Amino acid sequence: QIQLVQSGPELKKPGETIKISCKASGYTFTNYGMNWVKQTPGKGLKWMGWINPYTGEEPSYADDFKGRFAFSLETSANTAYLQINNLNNEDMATYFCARGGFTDYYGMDYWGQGTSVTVSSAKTTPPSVYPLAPGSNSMVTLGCLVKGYFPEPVTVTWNSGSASSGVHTFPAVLQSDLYTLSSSVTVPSSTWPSETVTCNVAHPASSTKVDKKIVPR
Amino acid sequence: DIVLTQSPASLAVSLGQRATISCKASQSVDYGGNSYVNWYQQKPGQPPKLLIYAASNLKSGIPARFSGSGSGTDFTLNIHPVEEEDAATYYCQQSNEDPWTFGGGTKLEIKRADAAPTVSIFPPSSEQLTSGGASVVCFLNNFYPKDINVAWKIDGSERQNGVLNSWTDQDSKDSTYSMSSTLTLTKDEYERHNSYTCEATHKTSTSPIVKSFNRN
Amino acid sequence: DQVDVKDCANHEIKKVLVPGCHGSEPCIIHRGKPFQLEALFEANQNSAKIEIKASIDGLEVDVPGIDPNACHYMLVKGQQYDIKYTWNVPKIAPKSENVVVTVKVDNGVLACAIATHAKIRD
């Protein structure tokens, strides 16, 4: 039951501020340090520093995060925060909170799911969803093309999660400040088109859900 | 700064075999009888998960297939036997002194037998045509190894511009890769030709896998 | 590696060693890391529970995570005995440049000491 849950991904414009949250539960909050960790998609992991909830003392920062970064607490709510001021392109990353062991021996044992921060002036754009049906074997492959959206992420499922095996969702490609990805589903030829096959696309940043049934051409 | 160097950076290991990952620290990480290096596993889209703490302690719930050893400046993670679910990237990390540092990492690929891609092509949907666009999609699914080529053909002739490709990460169950290929055109360009062809060329055969359709 | 303490009781303790520390100068205790001290004493009893007070700028605290059996790290009248003892400092422990550590141990007390030059850092 130990868990660290971070606030959701966010698109920020250059120059803006972001306050990322990390709510903890299942342990005595004040007995453990909270470490922050940055990961950029190209590169690896960078330890940003840490904050002490027992003392309430001034946090410790790694050299690269002095001045524009502020770690803070709301201890009654089991919540640690990372505020980043005057956002720039190099800040575009995933930020993780991670609990320090009671002592340093035990490592950073529990990690948040991460908070992907996008830094861009480009505008939030909902996706258009297109069915990929075979044109006019014992398995059949169908898909959904999810085109023209910003920012990441989108979620794609098939029959609401009911079809989970035989599914590939492909990493998005960015072109001209808009993302595109596809998903493919492979089912037995007997069961399509006799049983229906629907892709469910969600794009939370634009408050969009779309269902698209794959009908034969 | 304590620099941590991983050797190797990348590694391909067969099921049941040993994967040996070294981590070299630029100065000693020992203090007071302990060695302050921990080992993490990261799968794509996921947070790092701690395997080993203080060089040689196996974290509870991690199977003993993972084995950490070493002291001072020289650390080793052994995974033996390797399993499908071990496709991931592994980081060493030092907690001896500020700033805490991570190594650059080691990406572990699981060797499996070669498999040819299942190829499928799709015409632009009628919905997309109403917006003025037309994307032709080719899926290359469940192949090994990762290396592969796709060629686009329109009326028998080769096409370079407007093609974009995207590989999945190594599947955690069957160890294959899959790749998509999206040829994007305008409605008008699309309707100017008839025959649209996707050709996958892969290690497994000197013959391209040809999937085609006709607009009409 | 020997350091200056102060005998609260009857001089039973002859010396105190701390890895890294010398005399009465700043002895650094790193939070989140083990703290090791070697003590030897001649107690004047036949028989042992260990009790550690520690004030941090006058927050007077009894130390948590103390293994209190002396014979888990190690006795009769008129003879010496050596003890090499480790306490692991919690990572969250408060930092201070003004620390006073007080350690003492069938029918009364065996040994006692006071150390005033520990500094908690990192």
From TrEMBL, chain C:
<dbReference type="InterPro" id="IPR003172">
    <property type="entry name" value="ML_dom"/>
</dbReference>
<keyword id="KW-0732">Signal</keyword>
<feature type="domain" description="MD-2-related lipid-recognition">
    <location>
        <begin position="5"/>
        <end position="117"/>
    </location>
</feature>
<feature type="disulfide bond">
    <location>
        <begin position="8"/>
        <end position="112"/>
    </location>
</feature>
<dbReference type="GO" id="GO:0005576">
    <property type="term" value="C:extracellular region"/>
</dbReference>
<feature type="disulfide bond">
    <location>
        <begin position="21"/>
        <end position="27"/>
    </location>
</feature>
<comment type="similarity">
    <text>Belongs to the NPC2 family.</text>
</comment>
<dbReference type="Pfam" id="PF02221">
    <property type="entry name" value="E1_DerP2_DerF2"/>
</dbReference>
<dbReference type="InterPro" id="IPR014756">
    <property type="entry name" value="Ig_E-set"/>
</dbReference>
<protein>
    <submittedName>
        <fullName>Der p 2 variant 3</fullName>
    </submittedName>
</protein>
<keyword id="KW-0964">Secreted</keyword>
<keyword id="KW-1015">Disulfide bond</keyword>
